[PDB]
Design a protein around this motif. Structure first.
Motif, short mmCIF file in Angstrom:
data_model
loop_
_atom_site.label_atom_id
_atom_site.label_comp_id
_atom_site.label_asym_id
_atom_site.label_seq_id
_atom_site.Cartn_x
_atom_site.Cartn_y
_atom_site.Cartn_z
N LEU A 181 35.69 17.96 158.90
CA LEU A 181 36.08 17.16 157.59
C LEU A 181 35.02 17.25 156.58
O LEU A 181 35.01 17.41 155.44
CB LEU A 181 37.06 16.30 157.91
N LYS A 182 33.84 16.45 156.94
CA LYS A 182 32.60 16.31 156.07
C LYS A 182 32.23 17.70 155.42
O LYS A 182 32.15 17.74 154.15
CB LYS A 182 31.30 15.93 156.96
N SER A 183 32.26 18.95 155.95
CA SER A 183 31.77 20.15 155.47
C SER A 183 32.96 20.53 154.32
O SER A 183 32.76 20.86 153.24
CB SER A 183 31.63 21.13 156.41
N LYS A 184 34.25 20.59 154.88
CA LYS A 184 35.20 21.03 153.87
C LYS A 184 35.35 20.06 152.62
O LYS A 184 35.55 20.84 151.54
CB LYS A 184 36.69 20.95 154.70
N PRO A 211 37.53 25.34 151.68
CA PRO A 211 37.68 24.41 150.40
C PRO A 211 38.91 24.43 149.62
O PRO A 211 39.55 25.54 149.56
CB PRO A 211 36.52 24.96 149.68
N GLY A 212 39.25 23.15 148.92
CA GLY A 212 40.44 23.12 148.33
C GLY A 212 41.32 21.94 148.76
O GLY A 212 40.70 20.91 149.23
N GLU A 213 42.70 22.06 148.59
CA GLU A 213 43.65 20.91 149.14
C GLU A 213 43.45 20.59 150.51
O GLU A 213 43.15 21.39 151.36
CB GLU A 213 44.86 21.24 148.54
N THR A 234 25.00 22.98 162.47
CA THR A 234 26.41 23.52 163.14
C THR A 234 26.85 24.39 162.33
O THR A 234 26.10 24.82 161.12
CB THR A 234 27.15 22.22 163.09
N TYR A 235 27.88 25.12 162.70
CA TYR A 235 28.54 25.97 161.88
C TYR A 235 28.92 25.24 160.58
O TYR A 235 28.86 25.85 159.70
CB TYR A 235 29.78 26.53 162.72
N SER A 236 29.50 24.09 160.80
CA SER A 236 30.07 23.38 159.68
C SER A 236 28.81 23.03 158.49
O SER A 236 29.09 23.28 157.12
CB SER A 236 30.77 22.17 159.89
N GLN A 237 27.66 22.67 159.16
CA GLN A 237 26.49 22.39 158.24
C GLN A 237 26.07 23.75 157.45
O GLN A 237 25.88 23.73 156.14
CB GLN A 237 25.34 21.74 159.11
N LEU A 238 26.06 24.81 158.12
CA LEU A 238 25.73 26.19 157.53
C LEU A 238 26.51 26.44 156.37
O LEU A 238 26.14 26.97 155.52
CB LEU A 238 25.66 27.36 158.65
N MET A 239 27.87 26.42 156.53
CA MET A 239 28.91 26.60 155.37
C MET A 239 28.56 25.83 154.19
O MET A 239 28.47 26.47 153.09
CB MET A 239 30.48 26.39 156.06
#
Ligand code: ZN
Ligand code: ZN
Ligand code: ZN
Lengths: 506, 512, 515
Positions: free
Chosen positions: A102-105, A276-278, A319-324
């Motif tokens: 959620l942090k990444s998004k 990313p987005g809503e 992580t994957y999320s951190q890389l994005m």
């Protein structure tokens, strides 16, 4: 699918939901009696600006404070630490992972508004990709909406509140408060069975003229705007049906609410997006509940809350999320600009890395744990003054990730070439051309004091006494070096961090 | 893909060195069809299906390779090359030097474990996972090894693919007319002018050319032989069928053209940012061409019989103008052979503050670590040479520096080391930051310690040639002390008696 | 290159592709069993001729019909109207624009084969420019034309290549077993999965497949038929022999799938920047797929028999929501048919300041320019309608604007024009900026003027349908309406003392005259 998730959550969380119409109307009346709707109009004008500054932010924050002062439906600052009990060991692991995602998004959605995305001299493909991202999130050469000294002052300033929506429709739409209530109620009724769409709204406006004020997204807007989302939310509060919007959290009930949400997640296969987005309904409820253990997560004034949801609720390489997040962050860089780079530690074992683009003032700055403790110890005494133990709390993996993400065929300036070249080559980046400026030691440090005087707050890692073979000297910092070397070349002496601070540190 | 883009750019740049060799490839194929024992081909394929192979197996392979070599005209010749400034610039030579260093590491790490082995016994789940990923990537008492052989150098150059051999085996073993095999391979060749043929392509080809069903698509370029029907071997053969298309497979190298060929490769390297990887496994196009060209200055790098060539590319082509990153990666992988649980002797020559010879020995498996170091205190070293080790300082000049720290760093955690006199070893290990290693002092009397001294040197003298000086005891001449022989003789003393041993470190790492 | 566009289309259109080998082979077998291959040889002979006539076209059309009668893979006449839905408003705009450009490119490529290009007494520069055009469209008195036919619309859709026909012809005429041909074409198809086969590739394949020596690799897709052994035909046939591979050649279109197919193509268009060329010649893969899909809503665009289909792609698929550059290029190429040296009549209906009908007529060759224009002055038009031309203004709404200026601007320099009233033609030519054109006034009396009026209308009535109103002369009595074209013809007949019986040739496409 999304309305399904919403309905399942309603059912499961029904015991935490109550009728709050009376309090919401009461808050609306307090706003009608005491708020300056000319300043509401003023903040609406500001939100219409393509580009907004700290003067604009002040007006918004001050108005939010005025609102907060008048209403009783308010969230309270309340940190939560989730421990094994009501939530199982497995529950905590799932929540930890989804909060990471959620942090990444959320960062990928909201951060560009202030950090910016370079949109200048790039390939047709690159421009298409970035234009797509900007469009998806509701957004020289750098495109940004907020130009501010401290982006943390944006936090929690943009939520929608039923009482505010109700008061603004009434005053600004020039209708009786009961007209506005009746109209939002009818909209709330639709929302029991469907997410209301433009046709639903169009139909209602014919019997409720106040509804023509609604511009038929949740992104890059404020509580003073007349979004369909804000209207649907207010409508939900008007009904006698277990609407999610009416949920109240307390430190006693936090864990059971989260347990209940996780029940729904499993049964339905809900997930945190990497888009990313809503927010989807799971992302949205998870964010809102985690912001505070004491309030009404959907509908209270949250504008006095500090911190983000992943900071305020905590579970007790990249992580994957951190890389994005990282790859998106790097889009702020202008690949054509003069860019300095400097490192502390050997190129085969670097411990601090900085890149600096003086024209825009953006910088990349991060740390790495040493492999070779013995050499690190000499480097500490004779160069950087870094305590190895302070590096334990920095985030691993960024050396590879950042170098990989540097734009293609960049030109990097340095003092001098050999160590940067070895480091870049080590990560396979032979396409980057290097300029060695080759200043004498004396000329290179002309502005050393001027730089530390201005930018000391940008780095607190250099704690040890450093010596020259002896006399004490000012520790070398990879960042301050870029800045002072640039200042020497330029004959004189802003700054945005490219990387989020919560990416550099763990 | 980036891989095929490198190939295409190499083809363009090297077109002048490409040749029409279909006729010669088919002639060699006919010579094999007429003269080779294909029941012995079947036999070698049988041995290659074995998970574990030995010297009897390697003999069959080498003998069959010699038989093939005898029959064919496309053969590479032993040709050492020394690259000097000329057609190649000073900078070119630096680049080639560096890339051959990296190539060495990548190839050793891919190929050497097949014979040296990797311990896969009592380890953590994490360690087992890591080592499985390596074994998987390279095509592979708790040690996993494919070749159990007395002399691993006899594996060198025995596994190459040759188009004439592939053509002959498809024909004979597939029971089709030569023309059918030529036709099928030509079509595969044509695909290869435009892309690297994949499983999809091969499947469609197979519907029209059933000979191609012999090729197993899910099968690597690793741990195979020229007798195997890999997609790679098929593509190589098809490339030779084209008489056109600037196929790299058709390049001939001579002493007169070698530098020009390398110069051309370097042009493409710079233009595309080609590189030698640090990933063990299949060779990329740059790795492949560099390896192949550097094997010999006189032959057809991709397609000749190379089974009679001795030495590796980095030995047969040399550049004339502590541990590298590449060397450290090779070391760390080499150390995987050790059993962290096993009885392990250690012994050193020179003082703990200035060692000149280090050895570790695991008797149960027979593996040993043995290397040298230049002394810092030449005065003490000279006393030690006369009264202990007999080492001539000048002989240490050819040894690789940097191994004391690198080896000791790489020793497995909580290993227990056995010692005739633990005080010295303790100092050295502690000086290198390894306080976690437990020690056992055996405390043999001087007489008991050397009971098996002559027996050990009798068996193992070939393992160390560093001890040259006359050593005395206050005087009488005595046998010099060797750290390695001491480990072995001490263990023998404890065990009440005295195997082919296995060197953990490659010789090309102990010496420079 | 263009192969990239093909590969990208195959990737995007994969779901619409299918295996059709069995069906193609079945049709090839029907042809082998039932077609007269001596007549195939005969049509090959006709196609080798530099100049071909209606007798030749009959042979082709009849043979096409015999083929169509034997095969199952045929397209059927099916009009498509493209409306908003699967295709967006913007998608329809793009398709409308590309179809307009495609019209121009195809007409400029194909129309000269029948309409012809004057190559007589011209400057060195003109002859150079014209030869370059003839060369690029595959055309290697004074007029050069390949087809001399009464009705050029009978050429439409007669020249397509079909895999079953190609296979049957290779087999019968190459004197090999059907399986020999199938295997050879399969190997060519396999190469096509990876690249477009070139001469070197074909040479390699021919070594094991002697049948492939029948294929000529130099020869283009232009000025040929389905009975010819082009590389294009062979590759198309091979594309059908595979199992899988997403060959566009195997695509079937239906009324249900047409819009989605177009939507997919537009996806690829945007991605790669595909385009319709502004230049005549062979079609690129985008031009090719758009033309083939638009010809019929119900068929196999690449591989079916299409010889029974009437109309062009731009006529059979329409979009529902002065001259363009594309239209002007079409016009200027059509004008190349004119002999700038020949006697040329001109006449107009309407006043010179406001003409509504314009004709030019070259009697020697029989070619004519004829078009219409909407009037500015409705009051005067209505009087002219009653006393001269009998044209209903509403019938002029379907005529194409801007032709007056375009045609007059394109007239040959120093042309000599013969006319009955000089003054009105002078005013008109001056008004459009052409003071250079020399005029001859013929000066016939009213009576002598119209000696051949009935004879001309008797012969040529089908050439103009615009004159519908009763026209009168004050004594009132009803008279035959005046038509600019008929006037040219009858004035020439009066001067020449006779009207021959001849087919006339329209310089402008009816598609240019009307919208
Ligand atoms: Zn610093
Ligand atoms: Zn020794
Ligand atoms: Zn008319």
């Amino acid at each position: 699918k999304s309305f399904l998730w919403t309905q399942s959550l309603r059912r499961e969380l029904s015991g935490y939901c109550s009728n709050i119409k009376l309090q919401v109307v009461k808050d609306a009346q307090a706003l009608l009696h005491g708020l300056d709707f000319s300043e509401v109009s003023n903040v609406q004008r500001l939100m219409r600006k393509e580009r907004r500054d700290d003067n604009d932010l002040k007006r918004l924050r001050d108005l939010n404070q005025a609102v907060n002062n008048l209403v009783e439906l308010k969230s309270t600052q309340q940190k939560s630490i989730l421990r094994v009990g009501t939530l199982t060991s497995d529950d905590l692991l799932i929540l930890a992972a989804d909060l990471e995602k959620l942090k990444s998004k959320v960062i990928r959605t909201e951060r560009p508004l202030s950090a910016g995305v370079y949109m200048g001299n790039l390939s047709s493909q690159q421009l298409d990709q970035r234009r797509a991202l900007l469009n998806m999130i509701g957004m020289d050469g750098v495109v940004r909406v907020w130009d501010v000294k401290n982006a943390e002052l944006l936090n929690n300033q943009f939520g929608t509140m039923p009482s505010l929506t109700l008061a603004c429709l009434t005053k600004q739409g020039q209708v009786d408060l009961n007209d506005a209530v009746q109209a939002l109620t009818d909209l709330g009724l639709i929302y029991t069975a469907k997410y209301p769409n433009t046709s639903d709204l169009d139909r209602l406006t014919q019997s409720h003229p106040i509804l023509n004020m609604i511009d038929t997204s949740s992104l890059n807007i404020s509580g003073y705007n007349f979004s369909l989302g804000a209207a649907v939310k207010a409508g939900a509060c008007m009904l006698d049906g277990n609407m999610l919007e009416t949920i109240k959290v307390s430190p006693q009930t936090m864990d059971g609410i989260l347990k209940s949400i996780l029940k729904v997640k499993k049964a339905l296969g809900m997930f945190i997006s990497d888009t990313p987005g809503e927010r989807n309904p799971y992302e949205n409820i998870l964010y809102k509940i985690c912001l505070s253990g004491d309030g009404w997560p959907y509908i209270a004034s949250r504008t006095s809350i500090t911190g983000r949801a992943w900071e305020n609720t905590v579970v007790d390489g990249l992580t994957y999320s951190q890389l994005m997040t990282l790859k998106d962050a790097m889009l702020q860089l202008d690949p054509n600009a003069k860019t300095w780079m400097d490192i502390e530690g050997r190129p085969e074992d670097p411990v601090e890395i900085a890149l600096y683009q003086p024209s825009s003032g953006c910088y990349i700055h991060f740390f790495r744990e040493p492999t070779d403790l013995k050499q690190f110890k000499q480097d500490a005494k004779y160069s950087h003054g870094i305590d190895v133990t302070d590096l334990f709390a920095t985030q691993p993996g960024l050396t590879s990730a950042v170098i990989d993400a540097l734009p293609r065929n960049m030109v990097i300036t340095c003092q001098g070439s050999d160590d940067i070249r070895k480091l870049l080559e080590s990560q396979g980046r032979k396409d980057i051309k290097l300029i060695d400026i080759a200043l004498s030691k004396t000329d290179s440090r002309k502005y050393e004091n001027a730089v530390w005087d201005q930018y000391k707050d940008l780095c607190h890692m250099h704690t040890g006494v450093v010596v020259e073979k002896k006399e004490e000297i000012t520790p070398h910092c990879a960042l301050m070096d870029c800045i002072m070397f640039d200042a020497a070349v330029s004959g004189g002496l802003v700054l945005r961090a490219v990387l989020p601070r919560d990416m550099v540190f763990r």
